[PDB]
Amino acid sequence: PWQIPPGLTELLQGYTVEVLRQQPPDLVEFAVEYFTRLREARNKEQQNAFYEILHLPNLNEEQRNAFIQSLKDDPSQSANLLAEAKKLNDAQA
Amino acid sequence: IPPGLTELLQGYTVEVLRQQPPDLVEFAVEYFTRLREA
């Protein structure tokens, strides 16, 4: 459509706040820097979830699959899914 | 607010609305890199 992306404000907000802290001399160069590192952090954070869930010992095969399936489909809630998979795992001990 | 920050973030914002990329962060790396190259 032509909509306003959810999270656009928060995402722009955080770049600005970090601009404050370091006062980079070139806003463009820092943006390339900020968002690259913000990307890498997310890839890093997602990779890790996948595995942990991978070998969580008290999950049956069907649960591990559901969580991993949700994880591959939606990186943004990797923290949400890792939490839910650990809660359901701890209870299943 | 440092000078230029508003115009810079506005520019990115218009293109986000123009193009509706599926990931804002990934597009950000895309958008600002092209801007740096120019």
Numbering used by the authors:
A (entry chain B): 2 to 94
B (entry chain A): 5 to 42
The publication says:
To design amino acid sequences that can stabilize the alpha helical structure of the fusion sites, we superimposed one or two turns of terminal alpha helices of connecting proteins using a molecular graphics program. Then, the amino acid residues important for forming a fused helical structure were chosen from the two natural sequences in the superimposed region.
The crystal structure shows that the PKA_RIIα-protein A (end-to-end) fusion protein shows substantial structural variation at the fusion site. Asymmetric unit of the crystal has four fusion proteins. Structure of one of them is disordered at the fusion site and the protein A domain is not visible in the electron density map. The remaining three fusion proteins in the crystal show substantial structural variation at the fusion sites and their protein A domains could not be superimposed. The PKA_RIIα-protein A(end-to-end) fusion could be crystallized but the connecting helices in the crystal have substantial structural variation at the fusion sites. Therefore, overall structure of the fusion protein cannot be predicted with high confidence. We and others have demonstrated that the simple end-to-end ligation of helices does not create a single continuous helix, and therefore, the structures of the resulting fusion proteins cannot be predicted with high accuracy.
